[PDB]
Structure 1
């Protein structure tokens, strides 16, 4: 996260850190708890992941440094990537992780609601991007989960900033005209969380952008509301 601040313990309890363990253990991507056995994340996270066997999902983490050889984690039973996914910038950047067991929810590990039936035309004005990603293009994974408030932009404005890409209704963009706050490398797969009537909703999944926090280059997120039917089909199968 560029231009962000440190979170405190319990602040973003749906946020997970997805680790790979091959060839060494490290943070790969963010994700969001959406059910007791379900994480929603980005499809691009699994480029070069040989199988679910090497993945570990950690919940209830503020600092990457908390994770040691005895820290509990959830195994991944299945990775469900959207069947139309090819590359982040072309869309369908969405994946479900089915966990090997159920999360018992606690103050530190909580679900976030999907955008609700009947809310398709809500204007979200309180949206936040979170993660352990870089603070600039050439950086490192951060120890403490970072947060930044970022305004949504219209798809029409977003398309005008990305004339080399197809910005579709299945994407949502967020950024400041003058830049300075954004997601960056290592934030992908995590949430764009928006609060409406004091309830958090998973509005976006961090996906891609041109640079990080540049002027007139909003971050591009998977528009979760346009995948609710897909999510419900996969999580009810």
Structure 2
């Protein structure tokens, strides 16, 4: 996250850190708890992941330094990638992880609601991007979960910024005209979380941008409301 600040214990309890264990254990991507046994994340996270066996899902983490050889984690039973996914920059950047067991919800591990049937025309004005990503282009994974508030931009404006890409109704963009706040390397897969009537909704999945927090270069997110029928199909 560029231009963000440290989160506190319990602030983003749907946020997970997805780790690979091959050839060494490291943070790969963010993700979101959407159900007892379900993480929503980005399909691109699984590039060169040989199988679900090398994945670990850590919930209730504020600082990556908490993760030690005795820290409990969820095994991944199945990675479900959208069947139209080819690469982040061409969309369908969405995946479910089915966990090997159900999360007991606590103050530090809670689900986030999907966008609600009836709110397709809600204008979300309180959206946050979170993650352990770089805080500028040339950086490293951060210890402490970072947060940043970011305004949604019109698809029409987003497409004008990315005329070499298909900015579709299945994408949503967020960014300041003069940049300074954005997702960056290591934040992908995690949530764009918008609060509406004091209820948080998973509006976006961090997917891509050209650069991090450049002017007139909004981040691009998978538009979760456009995949609610797919999510429900796979999870039910």
**TM-score range for the pair, normalised by the shorter chain length:** over 0.9
Alpha-carbon deviation of 1:137?
A: 1.1
State the match for 1:34 in structure 2.
34
SS at match of 2:229: helix
Alignment length (residue pairs): 236
Alpha-carbon deviation of 1:190?
A: 0.1
Query: 5+ unaligned residues in a row in structure 1: which ranges?
Result: none
**Structure 2: distance between partners of 1:84 and 1:58:** 28
Deviations 1:195-232 (A, max 9, x none): 00000000000000010000000000000000000000
Alpha-carbon deviation of 1:7?
A: 0.1
SS at match of 2:226: helix
SS at match of 1:109: coil
Deviations 1:160-204 (A, max 9, x none): 000110000000000000000000000000000000000000000
Q: When the two structures are superposed, what TM-score results if normalisation uses the length of structure 2? A: 1.00
**RMSD of the alignment, in Å?**
0.2
State the match for 2:50 in structure 1.
50
**Structure 2: distance between partners of 1:210 and 1:161:** 10
SS at match of 1:234: helix
SS at match of 1:181: coil
State the match for 1:157 in structure 2.
157
Deviations 1:125-150 (A, max 9, x none): 00000000001111100000000000
Alpha-carbon deviation of 1:2?
A: 0.2
Deviations 1:54-94 (A, max 9, x none): 00000000000000000000000000000000000000000
**Structure 1: distance between partners of 2:18 and 2:36:** 16
Alpha-carbon deviation of 1:29?
A: 0.1
**Structure 2: distance between partners of 1:213 and 1:207:** 14
**Structure 1: distance between partners of 2:165 and 2:52:** 31
**Structure 2: distance between partners of 1:220 and 1:68:** 33
**Structure 2: distance between partners of 1:44 and 1:136:** 21
**Structure 2: distance between partners of 1:223 and 1:203:** 6
**Structure 2: distance between partners of 1:163 and 1:207:** 17
**Structure 2: distance between partners of 1:9 and 1:143:** 13
SS at match of 2:121: coil
**Structure 2: distance between partners of 1:90 and 1:67:** 34
Q: When the two structures are superposed, what TM-score results if normalisation uses the length of structure 1? A: 0.99
Deviations 1:96-130 (A, max 9, x none): 00000000000000000000000000000000000
Runs of 4+ in 1 over 3 A off after TM superposition: none
